[PDB]
Amino acid sequence: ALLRQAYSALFRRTSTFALTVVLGAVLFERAFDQGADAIFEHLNEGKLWKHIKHKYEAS
Amino acid sequence: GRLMDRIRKWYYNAAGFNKYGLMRDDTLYEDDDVKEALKRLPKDLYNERMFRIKRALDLSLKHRILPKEQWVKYEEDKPYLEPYLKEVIRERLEREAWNKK
Amino acid sequence: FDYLHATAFQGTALARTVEGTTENIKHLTRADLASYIDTHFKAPRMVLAAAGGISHKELVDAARQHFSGVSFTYKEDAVPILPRCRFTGSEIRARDDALPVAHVALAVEGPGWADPDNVVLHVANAIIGRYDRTFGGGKHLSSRLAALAVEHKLCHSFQTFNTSYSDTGLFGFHFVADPLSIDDMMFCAQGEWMRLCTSTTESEVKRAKNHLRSAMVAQLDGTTPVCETIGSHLLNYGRRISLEEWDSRISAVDARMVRDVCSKYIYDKCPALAAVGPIEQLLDYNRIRSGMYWI
Amino acid sequence: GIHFGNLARVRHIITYSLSPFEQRAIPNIFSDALPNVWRRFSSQVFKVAPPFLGAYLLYSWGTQEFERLKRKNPADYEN
Amino acid sequence: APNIRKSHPLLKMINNSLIDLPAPSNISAWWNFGSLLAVCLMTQILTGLLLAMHYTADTSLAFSSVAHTCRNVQYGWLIRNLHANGASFFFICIFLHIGRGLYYGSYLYKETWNTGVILLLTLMATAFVGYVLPWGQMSFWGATVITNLFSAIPYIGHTLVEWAWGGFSVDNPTLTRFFALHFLLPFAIAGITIIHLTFLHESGSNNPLGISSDSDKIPFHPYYSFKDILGLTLMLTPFLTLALFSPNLLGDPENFTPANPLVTPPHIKPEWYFLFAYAILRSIPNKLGGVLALAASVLILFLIPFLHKSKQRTMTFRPLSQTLFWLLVANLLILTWIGSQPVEHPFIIIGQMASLSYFTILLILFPTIGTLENKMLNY
Ligand code: HEM
Numbered sequence A: 001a002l003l004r005q006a007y008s009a010l011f012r013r014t015s016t017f018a019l020t021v022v023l024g025a026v027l028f029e030r031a032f033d034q035g036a037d038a039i040f041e042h043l044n045e046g047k048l049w050k051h052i053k054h055k056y057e058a059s
Numbered sequence B: 001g002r003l004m005d006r007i008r009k010w011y012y013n014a015a016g017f018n019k020y021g022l023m024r025d026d027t028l029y030e031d032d033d034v035k036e037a038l039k040r041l042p043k044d045l046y047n048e049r050m051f052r053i054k055r056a057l058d059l060s061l062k063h064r065i066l067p068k069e070q071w072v073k074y075e076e077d078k079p080y081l082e083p084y085l086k087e088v089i090r091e092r093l094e095r096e097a098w099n100k101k
Numbered sequence C: 001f002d003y004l005h006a007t008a009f010q011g012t013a014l015a016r017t018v019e020g021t022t023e024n025i026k027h028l029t030r031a032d033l034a035s036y037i038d039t040h041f042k043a044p045r046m047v048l049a050a051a052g053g054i055s056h057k058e059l060v061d062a063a064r065q066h067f068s069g070v071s072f073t074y075k076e077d078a079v080p081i082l083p084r085c086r087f088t089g090s091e092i093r094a095r096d097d098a099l100p101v102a103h104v105a106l107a108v109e110g111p112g113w114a115d116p117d118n119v120v121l122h123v124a125n126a127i128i129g130r131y132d133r134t135f136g137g138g139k140h141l142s143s144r145l146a147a148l149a150v151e152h153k154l155c156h157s158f159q160t161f162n163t164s165y166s167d168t169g170l171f172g173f174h175f176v177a178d179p180l181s182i183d184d185m186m187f188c189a190q191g192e193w194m195r196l197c198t199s200t201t202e203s204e205v206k207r208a209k210n211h212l213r214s215a216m217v218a219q220l221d222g223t224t225p226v227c228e229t230i231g232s233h234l235l236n237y238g239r240r241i242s243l244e245e246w247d248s249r250i251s252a253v254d255a256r257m258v259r260d261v262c263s264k265y266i267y268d269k270c271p272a273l274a275a276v277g278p279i280e281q282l283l284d285y286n287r288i289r290s291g292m293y294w295i
Numbered sequence D: 001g002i003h004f005g006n007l008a009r010v011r012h013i014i015t016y017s018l019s020p021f022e023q024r025a026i027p028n029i030f031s032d033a034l035p036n037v038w039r040r041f042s043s044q045v046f047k048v049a050p051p052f053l054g055a056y057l058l059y060s061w062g063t064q065e066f067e068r069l070k071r072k073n074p075a076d077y078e079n
Numbered sequence E: 001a002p003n004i005r006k007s008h009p010l011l012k013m014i015n016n017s018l019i020d021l022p023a024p025s026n027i028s029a030w031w032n033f034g035s036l037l038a039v040c041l042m043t044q045i046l047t048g049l050l051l052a053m054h055y056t057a058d059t060s061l062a063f064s065s066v067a068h069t070c071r072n073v074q075y076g077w078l079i080r081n082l083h084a085n086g087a088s089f090f091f092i093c094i095f096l097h098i099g100r101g102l103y104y105g106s107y108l109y110k111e112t113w114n115t116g117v118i119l120l121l122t123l124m125a126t127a128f129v130g131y132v133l134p135w136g137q138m139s140f141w142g143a144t145v146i147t148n149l150f151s152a153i154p155y156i157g158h159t160l161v162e163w164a165w166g167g168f169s170v171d172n173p174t175l176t177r178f179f180a181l182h183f184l185l186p187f188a189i190a191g192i193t194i195i196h197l198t199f200l201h202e203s204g205s206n207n208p209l210g211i212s213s214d215s216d217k218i219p220f221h222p223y224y225s226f227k228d229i230l231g232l233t234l235m236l237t238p239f240l241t242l243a244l245f246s247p248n249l250l251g252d253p254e255n256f257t258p259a260n261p262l263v264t265p266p267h268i269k270p271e272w273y274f275l276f277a278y279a280i281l282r283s284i285p286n287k288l289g290g291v292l293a294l295a296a297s298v299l300i301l302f303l304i305p306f307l308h309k310s311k312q313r314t315m316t317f318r319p320l321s322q323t324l325f326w327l328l329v330a331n332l333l334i335l336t337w338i339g340s341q342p343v344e345h346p347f348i349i350i351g352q353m354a355s356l357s358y359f360t361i362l363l364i365l366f367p368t369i370g371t372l373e374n375k376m377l378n379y
């Protein structure tokens, strides 16, 4: 049971609760960022310089 | 005549303070006279008026009203404070007049 | 305390007063009392206890002679098991600003006679102890809460309590105070509970133990008391628990133990509250709730 | 400073409440909630909406009427 | 002693004005504007400084500094936005904060109210001069007209205009003393805000039903602290959806054209939150009258507490006042439209009406229907 495993190990102790928010905010960020950028770039295929780019680059 | 005497009953249902269980007098805004009046209310009449109000507020925090059945009815509304208040304002006008005099 | 049960175990059997309702007493019939005696006052569920200058033998004989009921089926020799009572974290506020002082009781669900932890819990209750307006000790009392109580005039009296039942219980405290100091008292009180779960020392427990040991002996100060112990030991703990034993269990306790146990039944739990009197200054369950964590 | 204890004199009122951990956050969404959302909407939509719908017209009118005065009336150059 | 929350000369304040504060248990969402208004102030002030650190109060450099602030300053563009749009959401919020007060007779708390009116005037003045700093077309002509208002005073008038400009026609001195002025005012706001809230505390908050809530108060925290955090994330969503997706929606574009002392744009309208007054100004076809009407268009707020006749506090139980109240809202909603239209028929006539309408619903109707209602209750 995660809710109990979590409560007992993470949410109970007001000190571990913090560690969770930090540790979590870190993971949440790194993922929410890729995802959104991934969503956005996809919604604008071939319009961004990330796409055009290869045409005047080097190889 | 019996004109604004039926209008009154209309307005009374229009206001809707009865939907909360408040007598017309439970809604009076507490200025100086009203405050004095309320201090003259007999123990029980005061404790009842209190519950009515503390209950209406609890309703308002919940965003509800009383089931239609419990609503006060235009003719069963006791003007429990009206007479006291009348006197308070009466005693006052005396003083006021007596002091300019 | 009734209102406390009344809401702590709300919706169950324990939530009832011993005296019963007004309607019941006004209508209970000869039949019911009869049927009550018939259904409940039965040999397997009774215990003839006695203490003093008496022959165990001569006692058992007199028993065989007048305490003679017979058992045929298995039903008669069966001791029913009661349907469990559900603990509810809630509150009941009975206000009357016309009463001289206010009364407040707070508790969490207890383990129940069986559990060995009840020992630790009682040691715990010793550390906090109790106090009241006439204690000579005053500002020097070893009970941190009693001191503060004295220092700031927090109350007229307060007391810890570990009421136990077959399968459940109530572990808490009760204080009486003036309308204008309920808040601080309640504040200091929860405060002392949290200290229990987090920073109890070896000095506090040592004394706690000695205080319990003495209360445990004063429990048996007379024949009536010793008989009451024996009557309630068989009926609840199963057999009889000797002082030599109790004492061994009480010695086994220490800091780590108290903390681990109080944390077990007190930390972050939703308590039950009962307030009676001019209780305006004490307020919000939400607040009292938050007093259940972080010392 | 502190107003908790002075406020007012109250007698004979009992209140029962339950911890938040024992109850539901948003209970009876259908049987209770929405019904009242509607209850309220109804009672009020006729004191509110009217004057708004009213100004609306005055808006659309004055708007279209200012546009009409831009257009030309043939009866000026049919000479 | 005992707790360090009630004794400490400071924490006893954070605690005694926002944590142990006695709050009515039934205040509705119309009570969440106090905090949003507060939050704006801090947000405005913060984003403001950030900008002041790249602005340059000088005619020959104001426009290009703001432009540079955006195109070059890292996230400058975002900060510029937030600051400009915060000005709007600040007004939106202050307007609802006012209505609420009007509809629920909070103005019966006279000092708390009068300080409020003062706040409004100050916020207006502030938002005005801020709008002048980028030195755009509106910036200039705005500065010109508003400072010109004093010219309506007999004798001095013109004299007063000389200071305001620092010369004999808007120019650099005006721009720098405006930047100084803008930089300063926000703090006076924050200052008075503190008084506003102090007078409040003497009495306590009002509530929808308008009857003493002493029988049922609750600790601001966690009830209203959580309710306000939420009320924040809601205002914040459209504020950001607006500022991030449609930046210039709410703003006039004339300010994208560097001021020209010789050309008054033909479509010269003020920031949206001032239109309604701009509308009244153009109603009265007389210099001094239009000015007086304008002044009174806001100053009339000081009279409200004195034009209360109902024997009840709020309009919750006054269906006639309600209608009149909502008829008043739509009344303003119109003036705003009028202000955004040219001075031509049918507008001119519709205008003078809504204005005449505005002053009547407040000075004559409300106090009248109020008296009437009293009799219908048999009082
Ligand atoms: C800088 C501007 C302002 C800020 C930051 C501000 C803030 C506050 C705050 C935080 C509250 C408490 C919570 C609430 O009831 O909303 C409050 C209450 C109040 N404010 Fe303001 N206010 C401002 C302007 C005004 C204005 C313009 C008026 C008057 C036209 C006003 C009238 C009131 C009144 C009457 C109260 C009591 C509300 C009640 O009855 O509950 N305020 N204000």
Ligand code: HEM
Pocket (backbone or CB within 6 Å): E041, E044, E045, E047, E048, E049, E050, E051, E052, E053, E055, E066, E080, E083, E084, E087, E090, E123, E126, E127, E128, E129, E130, E131, E132, E133, E134, E182, E183, E184, E185, E186, E187, E189
């Ligand atoms: C009362 C809160 C505030 C309000 C109402 C406010 C409002 C405004 C307004 C309307 C503008 C014009 C925005 C635009 O470009 O369209 C502005 C700009 C500006 N404000 Fe404020 N302001 C506030 C606080 C501050 C403070 C205290 C500072 C700095 C410490 C500041 C610095 C500036 C600067 C530098 C500009 C001009 C450049 C720009 O527009 O980005 N503001 N402000």
Ligand SMILES: CC(/C=C/[C@@]1(C)[C@H](C)CCC(=O)[C@@H]1C)=C\Cc1c(O)c(Cl)c(C)c(C=O)c1O
Pocket (backbone or CB within 6 Å): E018, E021, E022, E023, E027, E031, E032, E034, E035, E036, E038, E039, E197, E200, E201, E205, E220, E224, E225, E228, E229, E232
């Ligand atoms: C400005 C504010 C709260 C601000 C914050 C900043 C807290 C200090 C901490 C958590 C938050 O995020 C709130 C928004 C509250 C204003 C405020 C008041 O001043 C007063 Cl007298 C009352 C009675 C209320 C009632 O709701 C209120 O909201």
Ligand SMILES: CC(/C=C/[C@@]1(C)[C@H](C)CCC(=O)[C@@H]1C)=C\Cc1c(O)c(Cl)c(C)c(C=O)c1O
Pocket (backbone or CB within 6 Å): E121, E122, E124, E125, E126, E128, E138, E141, E142, E143, E145, E146, E268, E269, E270, E271, E274, E275, E277, E278, E281, E294, E295, E298
């Ligand atoms: C709305 C208004 C003035 C409002 C003030 C002057 C109040 C009367 C008092 C408090 C203030 O500080 C406001 C800025 C004036 C009308 C007004 C404007 O706002 C603006 Cl931006 C412009 C460009 C013009 C041009 O003609 C105008 O007539």
